[PDB]
Design a protein around this ligand. Structure first.
Ligand SMILES: *[C@@H]1O[C@H](CO)[C@@H](O[C@@H]2O[C@H](CO)[C@@H](O[C@@H]3O[C@H](CO[C@H]4O[C@H](CO)[C@@H](O)[C@H](O)[C@@H]4O)[C@@H](O)[C@H](O[C@H]4O[C@H](CO)[C@@H](O)[C@H](O)[C@@H]4O)[C@@H]3O)[C@H](O)[C@H]2NC(C)=O)[C@H](O)[C@H]1NC(C)=O
Lengths: 174, 148, 179, 86
């Protein structure tokens, strides 16, 4: 379909390899915060529509203008929160057994695929809170080693690649 | 099922509905009057405004409306906003201004509500004084109104 | 790439062409920031047919004015203004503070017809009658011409010309060949 | 199985540098034709003929862009590496 759909299927295949091989714990929160901002903006919109449908306009001008200004403020805050964390970060996960100690094991993923490019970038991040250490892993590969001639993206060669990447992250961890 | 597709559909619906109603309400607040973005559906002003033209309105803007301006009122017998042009004018020094209007390609002054007991039309049926127009978008509006 | 995606890109580029013509019209309306003056010359005005009619809504009066025109439209026409109207504001005074400059008749003017219009002794097209009948007992009426524009896609203002002609008027008299 | 995701993955392969330079030259030619049409509408002072020149440039762009060219499939035979089969 599109190279963005290729990136989406690649991230989904990485999550499928993670679920088939090591089974770590998913997270949420950024999409939940975006849905919270959109739910509050829809609350402003529904209150504005009901209050405009039940009351005439020259007696309802100023607080409706305040609702328009509030929509401007909420969309600006949504744009700033987009610029905070929605640049490259995709997947947030906790690892196995964070019990008995401080919450360690922040496993963070980011992807990069430029417009009209044959190169892919994957950045892994392992944050441990006992020693307060972050570990970055920049993986710049060429996409031409995985595709085929007429529509068969080989996963049987991509899965040992993710195995070697997880071995590298295991060396970085231990 | 997967709830993420439902939240993404709510996200896209929220984007399009909030954007459209925000543009509509922001324009009708920043004008000052109720200011509907109207579309000419009558061929009375055909050398001036052809069939299918968009008109955006402005406020009275602390200005008594003299002669030589187009006004948009509402016909209750058909419930349709109709635009005409002011010709004559009358003044009273208590905040009361009466006016006479006319349409092009016509011969008879429009009766409307009053016929002979008072002046010809009423000063409170007008929505506002017109500001500007688009000749291209109104044809697209008529095409979209061909399939309601 | 998809041919439908290339068609969507060409549709967005056609929207960019629409934005470019809107930008060109914005440059054009930003160039005509000054209002244009029109010279007017009215010499002979005759006021006749002054009939007092007992109207059912108000005691009204009928009027009839024969006038002259002399104008100039040399530097007025551009390549973006569509159609032009012609008014003739007559300003009178009443007892009930109806200080109105009021229009006798109207004229439709399309481009390509005449770049300069001048004639004489033309009578009014529409019949002048006033309900508040403040002319009877007044010695002051003011005539000044105004004229409206409409652009191709922009905002239409009104442009009033120059020349305020002050004409007196007797108390109770019917027809007069004035000057 | 995993063979269903294995098939509906790969779109039409593209020459990236050729399409980027073609898009840059495309926008340059369209913008230059728009500037020439604006100079024509400023000097010759005609609007409908300016719109006709813009539509003629749009038709030229459609004739140069819409059919899949043999040049646009010859360069993916050179710029792209040799990939495996089933
Ligand atoms: C008949 O009765 C009138 C009213 O008492 C006498 O006064 C003349 O009235 C006419 C119109 O009413 C004046 O002509 C134009 O008036 C416009 C409106 O101005 C009003 O407010 C001023 C005070 O600010 C009043 O003096 C005036 O009467 C109006 O009530 C002006 O906007 C016009 O200005 C023109 O020039 C300026 C530049 O200075 C331009 O920018 C404008 O666009 C416009 O072209 C104009 O003045 C007229 O000026 C009044 N005076 C005179 C001396 O004529 C009449 O005198 C009276 N006639 C007789 C025969 O007695």
């Amino acid at each position: 379909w599109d190279g963005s759909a290729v990136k989406n299927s690649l991230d989904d295949s990485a999550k499928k390899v993670l679920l088939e091989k090591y089974k770590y714990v998913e997270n949420f929160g950024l999409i939940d915060g975006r849905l919270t901002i959109c739910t509050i903006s829809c609350f402003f919109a529904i209150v504005a529509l009901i209050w405009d449908y039940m009351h005439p306009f020259p007696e309802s001008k100023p607080v409706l203008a305040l609702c328009v200004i509030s929509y401007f403020v909420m969309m600006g805050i949504l744009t700033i929160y987009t610029s905070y964390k929605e640049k490259s970060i995709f997947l947030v996960a906790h690892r196995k057994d964070p019990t008995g100690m401080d919450p360690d094991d922040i496993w963070q993923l980011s992807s990069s695929l430029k417009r009209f490019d044959d190169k892919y970038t994957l950045k892994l991040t392992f944050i441990s809170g006992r020693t307060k250490q972050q570990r970055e892993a920049e993986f710049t590969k060429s996409i031409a080693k995985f595709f085929d001639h007429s529509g068969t993206l080989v996963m049987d060669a991509y899965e040992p690649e993710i195995s070697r990447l997880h071995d590298s992250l295991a060396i970085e961890r231990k | 099922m997967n709830k993420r597709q439902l939240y993404y559909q709510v996200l896209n619906f929220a984007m399009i509905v909030s954007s459209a109603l925000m543009i509509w309400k922001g324009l009708i607040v920043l004008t000052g009057s109720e200011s509907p973005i109207v579309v000419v559906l009558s061929g009375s002003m055909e050398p001036a405004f052809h069939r299918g033209d968009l008109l955006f309105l402005t406020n009275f803007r602390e200005d008594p409306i003299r002669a030589g301006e187009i006004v948009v009122f509402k016909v209750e017998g058909r419930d349709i906003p109709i635009v005409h042009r002011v010709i004559k004018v009358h003044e009273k020094d208590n905040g009361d201004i009466k006016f006479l209007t006319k349409g092009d390609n016509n011969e008879v002054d429009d009766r409307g509500l009053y016929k002979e007991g008072q002046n010809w039309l009423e000063k409170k049926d007008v929505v506002g004084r017109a500001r500007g127009f688009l000749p291209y978008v109104g044809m697209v509006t008529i095409i979209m109104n061909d399939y309601p | 790439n998809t041919v439908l995606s290339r068609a969507n890109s060409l549709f967005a580029f056609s929207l960019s062409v629409m934005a470019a013509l809107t930008f060109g019209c914005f440059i054009t309306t930003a160039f005509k920031d000054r209002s244009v003056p029109v010279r007017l010359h009215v010499s002979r005005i005759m006021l006749k047919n002054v009939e007092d009619f007992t109207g059912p809504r108000e005691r009204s009066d009928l009027g009839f004015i024969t006038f002259d025109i002399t104008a100039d439209l040399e530097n007025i026409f551009d390549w973006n203004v569509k159609q032009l109207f012609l008014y003739l504001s007559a300003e009178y005074s009443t007892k009930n503070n109806a200080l109105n400059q009021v229009v006798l008749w109207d004229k439709i003017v399309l481009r390509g017809d005449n770049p300069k219009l001048l004639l004489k002794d033309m009578k009014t097209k529409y019949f002048f009658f006033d309900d508040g009948n403040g002319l009877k007992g007044n010695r002051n009426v003011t005539l000044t011409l105004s004229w409206n524009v409409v652009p191709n896609a922009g905002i239409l203002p009104l442009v009033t010309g120059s020349g305020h002609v002050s004409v007196p008027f007797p108390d109770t008299y019917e027809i007069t060949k004035s000057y | 199985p995993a063979m269903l995701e294995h098939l509906s993955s790969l779109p039409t392969q593209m020459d990236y540098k050729g399409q980027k330079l073609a898009e840059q030259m495309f926008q340059g030619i369209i913008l230059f034709s728009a500037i020439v049409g604006f100079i024509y509408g400023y000097v010759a002072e005609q609007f409908g003929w300016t719109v006709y020149i813009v539509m003629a440039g749009f038709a030229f762009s459609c004739l140069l862009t819409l059919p899949p060219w043999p040049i646009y499939r010859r360069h993916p035979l050179k710029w792209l590496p040799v990939q495996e089969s089933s």
